[PDB]
C-alpha cells in the first residue's frame, strides 16, 4: 500500500523463517560483523601484546597453536580504556598489533545480544504469549557483559577482560582468583547454588515426567512416538508423578501444580546466576571476597593455619606470577 509501510509489514511480520524485527535490525548487522571478524581473527590475526609492554602474544591458528588455546586476545594496557576503532590507527598493522580486533567483537557482540534480549520479548508480543522471557535472558547477558565490559571498566584497561577463546578463559579465571579471590565470596557462592541447583532440577524435572509417561506404544518402537505434536491430551499424568516424589521426600514438600513447578524451574538458576554476574560486577570495583587470613591464633599470637591461608598460599603464588614483567612496584592495585 504505502512504500514505507510495505517495509513495516515485512520486518514486523510473523511468517518469516527467522524473525528479524525491530530489535533485529540493530542485531543482525552488528552480530554478523562480530561473527565474521571473530572467525577471521581466530585463524589469522597477528600477535597482539596483551600485557601492554612489548611482547606480543599469539592467538591465531596459523601461528602454531590449537583449538583449546588461542583466543582473539584483548587490547593493550597502553590504549587503556580509550575508544580504539580501526580508523584511529595509522595503518591496519598498527591496529592489529595493539589489540585491535577484540574491541570489534566486544562492542558489536554486546550490542548484538542486548538486542537479542528484546527480540525474544518482541515475538512474544508478536504472538499472544505472555512476555516474560527477556527477563530470563538477562541472566546470561549479564553473565556475558560483566566479564567483557563491566570488569574491564573498574579494574582499569581492556586488557583485564575475557580473552574470548577456550583456554584464554582459563587464564582469566586464575588471574581473578589471584588478583581478588573469587571463591570466598558469597555472591559467587549464590551463583553456583543456582547452577548446581539448575544442574539437578534439569535432571530432576526432566527425569520424572520421562518416568511418569503413559503407555501408547509397544515395546519394539520408540516410546517417544505414540502421540502427535500439538495434541490436547497430556503425554503424562502429574498425579502419579506427585506422590512418587511425595513418597521419596516429605509428602508436604512436593509440587502439586505444574505451573507453580515450572516457575521454580525457571527461578533457581536464573535468580542464581545474576548473583554470580553481580559478583564479578561487584568484583569490578575491587569489592572482593573476604580473607580469613591469620584469623584464628594462639594466645601467643602465633598464626594457626586454616584452609583459608592454604587458599592464600595458592593465591599468593598466582598473584606473584601472573603478568610476570609489568609490575615494577610492589602492589598490584592497578
Amino acid at each position: 500500500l504505502n512504500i514505507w509501510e510495505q517495509f513495516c509489514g515485512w520486518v514486523t511480520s510473523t511468517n518469516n523463517r527467522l524473525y528479524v524485527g525491530w530489535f533485529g535490525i540493530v542485531m543482525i548487522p552488528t552480530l554478523l560483523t562480530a561473527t565474521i571478524c571473530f572467525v577471521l581473527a581466530f585463524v589469522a590475526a597477528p600477535p597482539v601484546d596483551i600485557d601492554g609492554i612489548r611482547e606480543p602474544v599469539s592467538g591465531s591458528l596459523l601461528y602454531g597453536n590449537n583449538i583449546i588455546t588461542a583466543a582473539v586476545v584483548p587490547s593493550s594496557n597502553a590504549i587503556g580504556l580509550h575508544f580504539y576503532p580501526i580508523w584511529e590507527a595509522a595503518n591496519i598493522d598498527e591496529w592489529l598489533y595493539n589489540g585491535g580486533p577484540y574491541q570489534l567483537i566486544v562492542f558489536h557482540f554486546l550490542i548484538g545480544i542486548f538486542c537479542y534480549m528484546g527480540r525474544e520479548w518482541e515475538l512474544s508480543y508478536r504472538l499472544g504469549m505472555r512476555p516474560w522471557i527477556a527477563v530470563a535472558y538477562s541472566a546470561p547477558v549479564a553473565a556475558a557483559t560483566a566479564v567483557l565490559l563491566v570488569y574491564s571498566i573498574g579494574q582499569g584497561s581492556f586488557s583485564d577482560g575475557l580473552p574470548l577463546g577456550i583456554s584464554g578463559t582459563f587464564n582469566f579465571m586464575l588471574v581473578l582468583q589471584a588478583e581478588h579471590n573469587v571463591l570466598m565470596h558469597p555472591f559467587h557462592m549464590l551463583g553456583v547454588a543456582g547452577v548446581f541447583g539448575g544442574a539437578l532440577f534439569s535432571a530432576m524435572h526432566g527425569s520424572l515426567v520421562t518416568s511418569s509417561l503413559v503407555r501408547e506404544t509397544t515395546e519394539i518402537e520408540s516410546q517417544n512416538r505414540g502421540y502427535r505434536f500439538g495434541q490436547e491430551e497430556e503425554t503424562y499424568n502429574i498425579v502419579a508423578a506427585h506422590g512418587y516424589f511425595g513418597r521419596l521426600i516429605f509428602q508436604y514438600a512436593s509440587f502439586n501444580n505444574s505451573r507453580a513447578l515450572h516457575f521454580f524451574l525457571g527461578a533457581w538458576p536464573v535468580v542464581g546466576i545474576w548473583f554470580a554476574s553481580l559478583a564479578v560486577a561487584c568484583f569490578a570495583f575491587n569489592l572482593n571476597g573476604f580473607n580469613f587470613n591469620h584469623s584464628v591464633l594462639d594466645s601467643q599470637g602465633k598464626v594457626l593455619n586454616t584452609w583459608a591461608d592454604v587458599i592464600n598460599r595458592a593465591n599468593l603464588g598466582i598473584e606473584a606470577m601472573h603478568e610476570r614483567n609489568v609490575h615494577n612496584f610492589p602492589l598490584d592495585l592497578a
Binding site: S299, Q300, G301, K302, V303, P330
Partner: protein, 135 residues
Amino acid sequence: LELTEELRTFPINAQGDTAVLSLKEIKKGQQVFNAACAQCHALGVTKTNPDVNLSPEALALATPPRDNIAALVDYIKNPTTYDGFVEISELHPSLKSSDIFPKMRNISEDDLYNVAGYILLQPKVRGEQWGGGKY
C-alpha cells in the same frame, strides 16, 4: 604456650634493663596498632618504603637501635632515617608533626608505650610474621 609473663619481657630502655607488661595494655596496644600504626605497617612490612621492615633482624640495624621501647617511643616522637641524620617529620606521622598528621592528636605517651611493646612481641611469637612474608 599460655603467653606467660617472662616471654613478654623485653628491654624497655637503652641497653641495660627491661620491664614486665601485663595483658590488657597489649590489647589496646593492638587496637591502636590497627588504627594508626596500620595502613603502612600491616604484617611488619612498610608499604611505602619497601625495605624498612619491622623485623628485629632489621630493627637492630637502624642506628641508634630501635629495640628499646623508650627509644621506640622516642622514634615515634622524633622519627628519623637509619642513621639519625635528618628528621623525616615531613613524611611520617609523629607528635612533633601533629598539625601535619591529624591522627596523632588523640594519643598519649603511654598509648605509644604499649604499641612499642606490641610491635616487637609479634616477632617473638612468629618468625615469618613481621618479615618479608613472601613465604
